[PDB]
Design a protein around this ligand. Sequence first.
Ligand SMILES: O=C1Nc2ccc(Cl)cc2[C@@](C#CC2CC2)(C(F)(F)F)O1
Lengths: 405, 557
Amino acid sequence: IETVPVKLKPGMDGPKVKQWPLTEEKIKALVEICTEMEKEGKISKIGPENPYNTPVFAIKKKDSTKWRKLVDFRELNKRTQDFWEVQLGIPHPAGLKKKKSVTVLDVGDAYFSVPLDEDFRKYTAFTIPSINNETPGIRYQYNVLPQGWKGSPAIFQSSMTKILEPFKKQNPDIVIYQYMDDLYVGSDLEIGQHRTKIEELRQHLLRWGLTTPGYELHPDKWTVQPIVLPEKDSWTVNDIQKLVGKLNWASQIYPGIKVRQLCKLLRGTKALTEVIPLTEEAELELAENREILKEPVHGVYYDPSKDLIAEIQKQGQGQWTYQIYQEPFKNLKTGKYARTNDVKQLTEAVQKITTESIVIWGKTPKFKLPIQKETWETWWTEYWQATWIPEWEFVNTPPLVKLWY
Amino acid sequence: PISPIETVPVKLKPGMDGPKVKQWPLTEEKIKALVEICTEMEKEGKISKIGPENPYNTPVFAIKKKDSTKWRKLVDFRELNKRTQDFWEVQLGIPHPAGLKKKKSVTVLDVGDAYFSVPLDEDFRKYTAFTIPSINNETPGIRYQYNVLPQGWKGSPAIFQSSMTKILEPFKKQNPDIVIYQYMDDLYVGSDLEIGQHRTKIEELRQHLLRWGLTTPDKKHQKEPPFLWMGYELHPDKWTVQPIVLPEKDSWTVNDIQKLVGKLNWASQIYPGIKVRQLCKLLRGTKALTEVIPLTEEAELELAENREILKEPVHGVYYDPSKDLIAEIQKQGQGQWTYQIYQEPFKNLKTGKYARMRGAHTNDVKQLTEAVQKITTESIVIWGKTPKFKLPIQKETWETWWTEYWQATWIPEWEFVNTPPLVKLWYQLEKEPIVGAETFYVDGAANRETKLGKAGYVTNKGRQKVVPLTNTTNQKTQLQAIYLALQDSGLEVNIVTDSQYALGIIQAQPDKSESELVNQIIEQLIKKEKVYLAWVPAHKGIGGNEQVDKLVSAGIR
Ligand SMILES: O=C1Nc2ccc(Cl)cc2[C@@](C#CC2CC2)(C(F)(F)F)O1
């Protein structure tokens, strides 16, 4: 078939990112995958005349011992945003998040069927390092649409439609959304019928040379993570002082949180241990304040133009709380994540959050991760299972974990 | 020769054309020099004649060789280079000796006239055009262009190494048992064969190379390990660093100290215990490079221990893929960490040290964690796998600190190993207030234009002190106010602050800091038996904060 012409955002030049050092086992994993990808002509070796580079890693399938290749095209996606967002963007259905069930299907192998503009290929150059640098280090570039690239879905968008067409006409109440390598399929059917309609879909896919996984989400049951206020039988100065600290916070967010009554309550210079009475305005203010804290902030709306930000706090005991927002302290959504290694968990939380994020807004958030850069980089690709990679900056969590948001 | 091998197509950067720099007039003897030289190259293909149709000209020079015996041809390519395309980096790393496998026989071959044995891309030659002037610029001068890689051009290193790789692929494939590391125009070949069957294979290699235009030594193989390479001395058996020699002089100049420090840090890869803290302290401050610096007591001794450690040669052994990697970390002094990596008890593969501070206010458990990270990263680059750690910390101490800390932390498989100083948390902060314990409501303030503050406090027992301060920020007045609550206070004390900033530092159980106050506030903390720290909103009017705040900010605010 003919190749779609692609171009970079003028002024910007191809990726020149370093290849993070890998462990022996993933290097072996990769030379096998790349050795085979070459026979099939999906990638060709390149020469030093190519100054470009995009990093690559090896992760695991849906827990099957088979290694998958993961190219970190985070950079090149930024250098191409114009192409895949405005020029050939893919619309996001507001109905998806409402569906009783959503299945995620990895339609990535579908891209290796299409060729890549002979002129763009150089930009997809990657390198398979070698241990202790005892060897130059294998270089390659893609000939077909690569998987981590947000350009792939956009181009293939035309074919995906022909494929899905029949299935869609025969199933008007089923939403299908494509997002970089995956298809999201949601319906309000009963688990049985849904799971059934999925198999049906795989059969259609199957006819265009494309197998499938599984993995079900239930968006209609995604609820807010309120900011809770203690409710103890007793009450100490300390307990009430804190109750005022957190409440105070709930002021620069959730307009209307009255704390003028609870405050000034039992004041002066008393010990912290000293137990205290109660107030009628108290029970009322508490109730009212928490009542307000249960439901979403007023005046906060999603703004398609601005970035999304996900902040995560390590609560302790395998507990993790996070907030997604665009304007600091103006939360679009908050949540929790629970249930061995802190890094292993955190990576899981990020993937969960990114998924929820993609279902609700169609874009991934940028993460403010509560960890040490080096530690994260050394281990994330050890528990990671997604096909995409979100944006991330390493932050330093304040004594804010006190309040849940 | 001139290797048959395909040629790497190079081009100039996008919006640019070949170079056009006028040829500055050279002297007669020089003009003779270049003439005698080019002619030479020309007869061999390295270059060829071209007329005045080539609008591209790059300057030429000539300078005498060793003792002024023969001249050399210098081609200032600065211009072609800024106009030449960018390439892929030659080496993004260097093998670390400790990551090399032990070999039985090893020899090093060196490609003669490498750059000139590789064919420059035709479509590019036109840019590497220069001219040999006529006595006092009259005649036209001779014009030449290149047909092989120019020894000073941007892409010769890249293109040469790439070619040598393609030329070797067949051979390596035929002898997967032969390891060949290529560093510039040198080839390190090692095998587990016998010196007899080794040299046999070697010739087989020289042959394969000849069939490709690359000439190689005959008996000048230089093999004969030792091998001085990249500051190392390689043996088929082991490895170590180039011999270090400590000057031993009366007075030391800044320049002398730096060199010393540089060598010792280079020695620390295999020599355990090298210390440079004291010597490095002496270089703080913009001091003349020729300025003499007297050695403090501490330094004088540090140089001694180092002196001691270096007297007997120490070697590192090579990597055995079949065995595990063990890494043990010891705590030397404050903020200093040393470690060893071995496979068989005490036969070190590599050594090293960690001292990095990493911000102000930090504690040993946090630093040990950092050393583990560094060693882990380093371990992956060199050996491809993370080692098992033997740390001087209790599984107890670790478990407790990790689970409560705000930051997510991991740490590969480890084991305690009782090698004092053991790492420990020097104090804990209570979680629940201390009943029947004074409650100091500290506070502070400071006039911004003046820099006058009043760190003070008030308790639930009437006591209320307010010491004035000069030249302190709004923060220090809050950190100073907490220092107070710790002094005139019992062994158990509840402190209620409104400085999230203060809460932050203290809450992270730091046992060493860059702040003078913070280190003081630490002694206190390590002396109390129960400390409870709570926070409440600043000048928002709360029972306690308001009151102290009153005598704290009344005047001088
Ligand atoms: O794996 C090994 N073992 C080894 C052992 C002793 C000596 Cl001297 C040399 C080597 C070798 C190398 C190299 C270059 C970095 C110096 C060789 F490639 F074999 F030459 O790398």
